[PDB]
Design a protein around this ligand. Structure first.
Ligand SMILES: NC(=O)c1ccc[n+]([C@@H]2O[C@H](COP(=O)([O-])OP(=O)(O)OC[C@H]3O[C@@H](n4cnc5c(N)ncnc54)[C@H](O)[C@@H]3O)[C@@H](O)[C@H]2O)c1
Ligand SMILES: C[C@@H](CCC(=O)O)C(=O)O
Ligand SMILES: C[C@@H](CCC(=O)O)C(=O)O
Lengths: 291, 290
């Protein structure tokens, strides 16, 4: 149903997400403290406001799409008292599980409904409205939120209680990072063995080793012409963002006392690579295994 | 139609040879274990006291043996007994270096030779669904194809000699890494209060998906048939995975390659095989706190 939505954070993800909500007939009230972000969002039909409290004042739903837990926490502290009681808050930022539960609790103590709904699919998913939302919180609250999320989404998955969205995401992305390094390692070893890249591709993809890091993101040019390796390692999914998600994985590991040997090794590998190659697709880590 | 000498009639070699008999081949056999040889003779293999005798009348000689050293020693023991242009197929899993050496040895005797290691285990072997990954010439593979077919679900030409070994060892190194990574994720999810079923639904629907989770799920429930629901009965044993990883490490050393994650997995599984060699390799989920 047609709803008034405050959208806080109108950057690379926020702006195309808000555009799709405008497209779907929603009244969208935006705030972003970077005026260039606000401007682009305004051009696609977002009513932009001077302050986050103002955007929130007349909203049935408040979406945050923000860079860090700290920024989300700060935003919530600024805006929750300005919101009408029992407003629905959706945080679609990617933040630590700890941060997520903290801000969830904060929202509920102000009388607001709240979900964590971080997304995968990147800017291209965002623009095409094919993002996967991975949701933590009450089933009934998600029920309410569904018609707001659908115009932005390819998939909506209920993961469990508050924080389970962030948890599911960060677990997947840790696995992914490990797979991307492992695939790169196999391709270089193959090369040193005289096994052709095409041959190795055909085998792994036909065998138990198959995974998106090879079938879609193949780190050598040729076998999958759409993969970033064929395009100077243009993201795609940048090393900067993978390194962020791995930091959040390591936060979760630290918070739980879990043991994740390879997840953590992959974290240290991507952190070193991020220093000088933050801008390249995460499949570019193959470069560290050659010469 | 064809006479085949089958050298190595063990857990894999016995059922593979039974399938060859089943497809109308004359199978001649050798194994140093009487129990293996006897079982094989029970399903139609003519068992001989030595490998050179088994080889004498054969058009094709298949090896299924435990190490490159044994394969090399077999070749040097039988090559003079073979007729010229006999087709040698090594379906042992040995190092790429060993494969190429024995390939060159065989061809120097005017024989034709392939490396064709297999995936699928005893189960696959008995069911005739093994995946053969082949190195050697395409024309030689073509000539071999009617022998491989009755043992095989899948036959892939990987490249020149050694490429079959190479492809297998590279896939299994990745598999080992995946199996550990998936296990990490399940125990992480559990400590975060994320249910095993929710994690499973997400990963299988997302970029992290792989066989290690969709078929070998290391926690019981999401995949009722996975070894986790059956006391981690193999499946694919830790002993065997540890074997393949040893071979990956030889290949890494031999080439001077950088394989930090593959190597780390190799370390983990080598440790784990000291205590739980007989369990499915997905059981590694319960050795993360070591
Ligand atoms: N490929 C991707 O871009 C991708 C994919 C999935 C998830 N994510 C995650 O999405 C989140 C944001 O993505 P993005 O690309 O839009 O980030 P971005 O950094 O491009 O934009 C963040 C925006 O938030 C604004 N902001 C900061 N403080 C604010 C406040 N108090 N109120 C309102 N706005 C504020 C900033 O000015 C900026 O425009 C991150 O948590 C990121 O890790 C990104
Ligand atoms: C993703 C959502 C439908 C919305 C859409 O396709 O934009 C659903 O299937 O739950
Ligand atoms: C030719 C066939 C193998 C025959 C078999 O199924 O046993 C295949 O390549 O799949």
């Amino acid at each position: 149903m047609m709803t008034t939505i405050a959208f806080l954070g109108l950057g690379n993800m926020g702006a195309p997400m808000s555009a799709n909500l405008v497209g779907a007939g929603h009244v969208v009230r935006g705030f972003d403290p970077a005026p260039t972000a606000a401007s682009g969002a305004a051009a696609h039909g977002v009513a932009v406001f001077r302050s986050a409290p103002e955007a929130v004042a007349e909203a049935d739903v408040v979406i945050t799409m923000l860079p860090t837990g700290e920024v989300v926490r700060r935003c919530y502290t600024d805006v929750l008292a300005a919101a009408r009681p029992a407003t629905l808050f959706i945080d679609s930022s990617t933040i630590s599980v700890t941060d997520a539960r903290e801000v969830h609790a904060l929202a509920e103590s102000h009388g607001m409904l709240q979900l964590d709904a971080p997304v995968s699919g990147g800017v291209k998913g965002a623009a095409a409205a094919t993002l996967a939302f991975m949701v933590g919180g009450d089933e009934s609250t998600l029920r309410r939120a569904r018609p707001v999320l659908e115009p932005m989404a390819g998939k909506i998955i209920h993961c469990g209680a508050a924080g389970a969205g962030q948890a599911a995401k960060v677990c997947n992305n840790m696995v992914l990072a490990v797979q991307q390094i492992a695939i790169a390692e196999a391709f270089v070893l193959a090369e040193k063995l005289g096994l052709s890249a095409q041959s190795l591709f055909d085998v792994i993809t036909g065998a138990t080793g198959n995974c998106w890091a090879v079938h879609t993101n193949c780190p050598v040019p040729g076998p999958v012409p759409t993969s970033p390796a064929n395009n100077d390692f243009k993201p795609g999914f940048s090393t900067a963002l993978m390194n962020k998600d791995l930091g959040l994985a390591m936060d979760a590991v630290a918070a739980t006392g879990a043991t994740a040997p390879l997840g953590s090794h992959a974290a240290d590998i991507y952190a070193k690579f991020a220093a000088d190659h933050a801008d390249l697709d995460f499949s570019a880590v193959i470069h560290t295994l050659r010469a």
